[PDB]
Amino acid sequence: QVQLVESGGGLVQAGGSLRLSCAASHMRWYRQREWVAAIYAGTHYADSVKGRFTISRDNAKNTVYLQMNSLKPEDTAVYYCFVYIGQGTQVTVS
Amino acid sequence: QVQLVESGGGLVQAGGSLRLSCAASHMRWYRQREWVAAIYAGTHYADSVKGRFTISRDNAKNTVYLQMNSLKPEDTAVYYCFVYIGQGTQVTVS
Amino acid sequence: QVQLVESGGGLVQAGGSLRLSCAASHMRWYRQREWVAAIYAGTHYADSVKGRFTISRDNAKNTVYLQMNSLKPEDTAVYYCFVYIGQGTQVTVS
């Protein structure tokens, strides 16, 4: 009965900021599939995105927000959400 | 009942100065998590940030002040406070 | 009831001279932390700064003055006073 829907996909130039909002109707974040971040307010990140991405959840909205900072074309992939596999959105950086 | 809030952050370019203030109702300063500085008036500084950082506290205001001079992009990270964990505020240098 | 405060620092170009004045209410000088000079009125200096620094004290003013000559950017550091540790002042040479 719980479906993870992600929003915020599109095209963002290098060095910009994006917000990927996943709504849930202990979460994890993956990219393609490579693990990115894990949350419970303890947060964990891979060394590839350590100090770059920020993950925050709020029970008021039942949403998980990931902040993409210092984006580069090298990290062009599709981001998925995990608690059940999120459908995910493709983010392209030029 | 003691709440820690990080204040004085933001974005400062290279060569600038920044002041970090935390209100507490033996302190430690951290960045991400990397140990930064600790106090008793006796003070300690990490080798990676030695020669650059300064931490002071006053008992009257129950606040701890961190003095930061000639900042560089290498220290682009979110700073947390420790004694119970502070919220932490993101500080970026470009 | 005794407090140490440093004064006389600033930014001075290469080849110039600067005066350090410390107010106290047998003193040694430290830069950072490396020992610099000592006083009784006999004085002792370190080899790395020998021939450039001269320290004198006066009991009437109850203050210590250090003469630094032919300053260069290679010694850009904040200088502290030890009798208790002084707050210190930052000196930068271009």
Next chain:
Amino acid sequence: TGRAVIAPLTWLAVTLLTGTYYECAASEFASVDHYPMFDNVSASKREEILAGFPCCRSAPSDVILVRDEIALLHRYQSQMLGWILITLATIAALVSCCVAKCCSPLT
């Protein structure tokens, strides 16, 4: 008996002189009340870091110097223990010979 026990006593003396066994054995029993940096009011992270630093976790985060000191202390203590043991062993041997020269019916 002496030839029987000469091997384990030599083993113990060498191990205590080396001190690495004493270091990896008595690290979790170190004292933290003297160090204000090791307060760790959570009462949980203190024991994990205490058990984890001696092994391979260098972590040069303004902590190594502290840990170095504790190691030295244990090493010093280790040596003392070994020395003490040897002394006691020697004394025991002597008194044993005394029994061999007191309770022996043979001339």
